[PDB]
Design brief:
Distance between the termini of chain A: 55 Å
CATH topology of chain A: L-fuculose-1-phosphate Aldolase
Bound molecules: zinc ion
Shape of chain A: elongated
Number of helices of chain A: 12
Oligomer: part of a larger assembly
Largest interface: A-B, 33 and 31 residues
CATH superfamily of chain A: Class II aldolase/adducin N-terminal domain
Strand order of the largest sheet of chain A: 2-5-4-3-1-6-9-8-7
Helix content of chain A: 40-55%
Strand content of chain A: 15-25%
Structural class of chain A: alpha+beta
EC number (chains A, E): 4.1.2.19
Number of strands of chain A: 9
Number of domains of chain A: 1
GO molecular function (chains A, E): aldehyde-lyase activity; identical protein binding; metal ion binding; rhamnulose-1-phosphate aldolase activity
Order of helices and strands of chain A: HEHEEHHEEHEHHHEHEEHHH
GO cellular component, one term (chains A, E): cytosol
Pathway (chains A, E): Carbohydrate degradation; L-rhamnose degradation; glycerone phosphate from L-rhamnose: step 3/3
Keywords (chains A, E): Cytoplasm, Lyase, Metal-binding, Rhamnose metabolism, Zinc
CATH class of chain A: Alpha Beta
Chain lengths: 273, 274, 274, 274, 273, 274, 274
């Protein structure tokens, strides 16, 4: 027994580690939280801290009551997770009345969860309701090209979504619900956590202008691939725009044709363009 | 008997897909790869085959591939995961006696099935077999980043595109004198794109799917990979060049022709005409 | 006793220099890194030390650093080889009682010496110790690709450059609110450049050397690395943005202020006027 | 005695070709590398050579090479595979007593041969031996992505190209003061290009092949590699800069001259006129 | 990438760790070696040491040429493997002519492979030939009861084997080839490595009087279970003998009946009893 | 919908098997466990069922269990591995409309099948159902160490054995007044032992297999586990006692009878007679 | 700075005491453990120390241990709780300049004190430092179950007991060739027992206290723990063997000699006569 080999800890190491390599998380940039089941961490009750530190939650979140999550630490470097999981990751369990959580394991050296926790938890609640409990991952990282594009594209859900679909055939099917865009906002605040969550209701992908992206999915790999796909399209777009813009592209009709062949319903406002 | 995951072809598949992921050509479940094998290759591993092989109707009869085994990437599988769990992302399939379908002999575990571009692959294999008299054995599809970008700026035309790519790196003309075919954008994973791609495979070993990716054929894994990598390298150069305002000079026609002669290769005419 | 190569500082030096290399910031013998340690750190490895530590006189006295040990990268050594042979590219040195020089206690084998820049480093370590009440312990120089590029494109003025870098990534303002100092181009390795850099270190933890690279200071290897990585990340974003025709929108002057407040950090005033 | 695979030179060849691969400079069979050894190096492994070393008549004799052994990359070999199988992609060859040919003492298995360029290499080694009093021992060719791109945008003229590259990174002037030679595009593999490259090697340690790649000479593997990496790093910076609208500022003429003086190196003068 | 999460390193941590808990490996007692394929360690060539230490092999073993193994270290405590794999485990590769091996990874702090390496490698060769390459694991541990029994039972392959089969119905089928017994022998010597190997030819389980047991199997879990089964029978026997011996037991006829039902051919000398 | 591995019964199975491994009652693939479920239990998880459920002929018709689902341990599976990979060591099976066989709805992945003691389990379930009017739902087999040892020293006789076990711990009489049945040694995994065990299940909820293990039935996982654990605890006491030379005193008949009356339970007569 | 609870010594103390508990060697407040550290070890945690370290006079002066720091288990503390709250059951103490006492620098909270046996410990640390030229740094006392049992059965004579323990596990002779000392039963906690134990420590690294427990010395926590664990393992084997009627065969007197030779270790002479 050594929780560090559990599926979820290994999963967190792989996600963060890959994100590092993709160059989406310099310094302490980015954060990741995964909703677990008591059953996942039950085998390790003796691997936890016997003196659980408690931390009041920024605001009541009863829907996540008695729920455990494994999270990245605040000020922690994705690049270091793999070398010292316990020091950069932590397993937390929200009390019986969503008022706060206890740090069951990790987040050693008086470390604490990521500063975007409010944003994460709020998005989780909304994604739970929207996906009937399916989605279990919330991921934030500074996808280089997605970031760049927010300085050139009109920050509008529909047009941005439309550009991203055109940037890679695959995109319309991976995220038919398009991607939401918020106006720039001071980070780590509850004000921004709610805005993000508000958007998670309609999209599984949210962009933070001049900052990064937020993604939700059922598993680590599905979420990672979600972002990687959007970011891949963005990387293509950046090149294309650098070469002077599109000569031709995927047509509206074609996108609709694509949506049909895969039994998926594309965001309407994006198809209008 | 050595487990089949230590076979040369399984390791080959892990290597190609993994290198492709590293190159950044296969995000999410993007890209797929299929390799035609012989009975002798998988014959030693009968003992690793599933005991109730799954059978899957084939899109259309392909008698030319009857009783032919292939190792293939799975549907919705991530190239990035092939190394960790081969059996879960790769599968060895065998086309029945009348090219009507195939059995999944090994892998593609947990209800997984072959790639959704299978029709396109098998179709292209048949042509590449007829076109290379059995020499070709690999069909590879991946989202080569620059090649993709270029399809939004260059005239989607075989000749033009082929020409630019030759200019983008001296060896391109020798690695792919047959030039590269370009199809109009097409809803993917269908037979429609399968047929079209195959039609093009008759004339070229390299085919581009606008706003999507590239398709490559070759005798071996490394050759096929190198084929794409060369086209994609040229594309990477071109992208930079176009971003800097375009070519000030380049390889001339006389030179491309001089290049073709020295390596005893016959360059696609329409491409040289430009 | 656990060999010194497993110490947290030798491992830290390998990780920093290696990551820097993987990032493309240290071609050939480009870049160097020095970390100030404490006796309690190397004391445990008296067994791995050189029986007869080579001593090298410091051109100019560094008494304020008397008795202080540092682990440093060597001269002409390739960051890419640090991991290959730590002792051969790294060395632990200890400044004597009156800062007249230092003894090479460990590593720096086969007659190797610290970076020819130990002076600029030591000079900066001083100003940084003063500026942070002993907090900063690392001085890092590397050829951050994009930061370098931007120096050919942006006004080499601490304020303007600083504001661009803050706009290029929300986090920047909070990680380096005192902005980044920019020196005019200068012949590398000269006392002139060591003095200029140190002058800037009194004010900024990040200094740029036009058409050359960046200089960073921090309390720990990861902090200093992350400092540079953040500035370089913002630079990478900016380079793309400028390549696409410039910013359509960005972080407002106001908003940066709102940001500085939210993280109770005070932003370099000039970068917020212009 | 220890297997030759763990030799300093075999390991060096793996690391150079592998790093080159990882840099994206050697797609397919692009690039090649040769290193001149001393008998003393290979001596310890006399028992690792083939009992009946295959001899191979050299195109034209080269008495200055007579008896000198080299470890070289193979023909049609993929740099990316050196890692997995050195013996199959590398070979140690020894030139006879009158430099009329050589014997493949080790490696180059499965009937593989040296790069179909040993002659361009060997010819250049000769000039470099005379130009450096026997110091340079390596000739490296690779498809440096950005250097290649720049040849489609800059005037393919030694002086101007050399000047752009010096401006692209402060240490360039110091690392290659003799500048870089630029040949007009030419059919690779011919002897004309072998000749032309060699004539350029007398003046420069760095030569560019428009729309193809670069050629480098140096004393050690890491040096030669760092030579190219530095030129290529400068090119990478330049490509970004040009993509953002050209230089606002840069290193001045006086400054380069100042830089040269300080490092006791004499900058190629034509590159300072213009 | 971090070899410590590979299947085999995790496997070595689990085997040693379980052995610890079973109480079969105090101090540095016990050792474990697993034969790998280049393909298993190929993904990690950059996780290895760039300055491979070499160690002449006690004697020529060409059959294991170019073969990599992950092994426990000499003087290492099974109980510590899980907490510091690299320091207690090492991946070694035997040269092209079975003369020695290079320490590719782990065995940090100038540590080296287990002192029973000769015994292991020799047994491996014999198990390779006897199982047509199947078996890949050689495990040595101080199984408490198996050890005790060697002070009370006649140290004879047949009688010992027969007692162990009677001690648990399951035994005859798990190890029909019975278990070999060597006379006591000075340990860590080549003299004892050959004797063990000589026995591995006929049995997959070998006992070292007043010392421990040696087991071979195709996988970590199959080998571990092999020993655990023998040791379980031994634990039953010890209790039974402590209560005065067997009143009744499994008959010869019954053992033969058992051998038939499972399509296995029981060691003849053991069935004679 | 919550994955089926988080269902109460799957977690229950992980808990029982894991606790059993810890208790040292299930080495190698020793032991097996089966739990009868209702349609409502697995009804919510239809979406986790395999899409081509495997069907397996049943040893003999068991109409009494028609359309009845069970979660079971796999054949040759190690209790110790259930926690790590439930689906690979556990399986949910459903007996078809005429008790002729079952479908593996979920789990028992990778060609795995139910335990080899299945016949015995189902047979015992049918009797325990008839004997407890549907109350019992669990059948558990494990190699309880002491119980096993005792079968080599005590007269293999229901009454005697039952008596000793009651004396071995006061609560035994109340936990299992029906006493424990003992079968003669029998080749395992057959129907022969399946039938015999079932015959005994009619009279007892606890059955011993000389030189092998124990079989237990109960309404729930915990109760069934506690049943065995109590018998095995008594056995553990007895073993110690016998090792110390036997009982000096013990619970008298009058006392056992007094015990039975207080807890309104009727003790197996033959056992009290002794 | 990384909190001191993560230091290698605090973690070591948790692991030792905890394993000891899991083994059943430390019921209630049974057992204690002390480890001699060096300044370089705790120096880094001056931040976690008590601002006003409690000082406690040592009954008798321990000048030879002046200025020496030790991490120790507390008085009345339960080994089972060490992990639960290190600071509450462990403490780091430092002996003053003239060994007149020590200051409790860290831990030992809520008015807790070192084990009432710090004296016996300190006394033994001295003799062991003398005996091993500063090598031994750990003194461990625990109630090893089987070792305790054997003291009621074997002759309490260093030689006889030592020989039994060597016979009980091949490794024993090499791990403790100087044998184990046996004292007559003695009231615990008395200076008499501290002096007797120390007397024995001069000769053996392992000492037994009839009807009580064992005392061990070693260079590291793992070495000392493994020392005891080995002796206790041999004891466990012996207990079983004696319970089955005694040895039928064993390691011959001769063979033990052959063993001592093979590991170039010299076995306690008396244990080999008898
Ligand atoms: Zn962020
Ligand atoms: Zn595709
Ligand atoms: Zn520099
Ligand atoms: Zn070339
Ligand atoms: Zn042993
Ligand atoms: Zn059984
Ligand atoms: Zn005590």
């Amino acid at each position: 027994q050594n929780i560090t080999y559990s599926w979820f800890v290994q999963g967190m190491i792989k996600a963060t580690t890959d994100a590092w390599l993709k160059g989406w998380d310099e310094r302490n940039g980015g954060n990741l939280t995964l909703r677990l089941d008591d059953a996942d961490i039950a085998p390790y009750h003796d691997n936890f801290h016997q003196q659980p530190r408690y931390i009041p939650l920024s605001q009541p979140m009863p829907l996540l009551a008695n729920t455990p999550f494994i999270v990245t630490g605040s000020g922690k470097f994705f690049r270091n997770v793999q070398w010292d999981p316990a020091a950069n990751l932590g397993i937390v369990k929200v009390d019986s009345d969503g008022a706060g959580y206890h740090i069951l394991w990790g987040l050693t050296n008086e470390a604490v969860p990521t500063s975007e926790l409010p944003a994460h938890f709020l998005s989780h609640c909304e994604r739970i309701k929207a996906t009937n409990g399916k989605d279990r991952v919330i991921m934030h990282c500074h996808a280089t090209n997605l970031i760049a594009l927010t300085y050139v594209l009109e920050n509008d859900t529909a047009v941005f979504t439309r550009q991203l679909w055109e940037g890679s055939t695959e995109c319309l099917v991976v995220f038919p619900d398009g991607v939401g865009i918020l106006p720039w906002m001071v980070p780590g605040t509850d004000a921004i956590g709610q805005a993000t969550a508000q958007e998670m209701q309609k999209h599984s992908l949210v962009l933070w202008p001049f900052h990064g992206v937020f993604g939700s999915g059922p598993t680590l790999d599905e979420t990672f691939g979600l972002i990687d796909t959007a970011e891949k399209s963005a990387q293509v777009l950046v090149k294309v725009y650098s070469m002077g813009g599109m000569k031709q592209t995927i047509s509206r009709e074609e996108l609709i044709a694509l949506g049909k062949r895969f039994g998926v319903t594309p965001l309407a406002s994006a198809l209008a363009l």
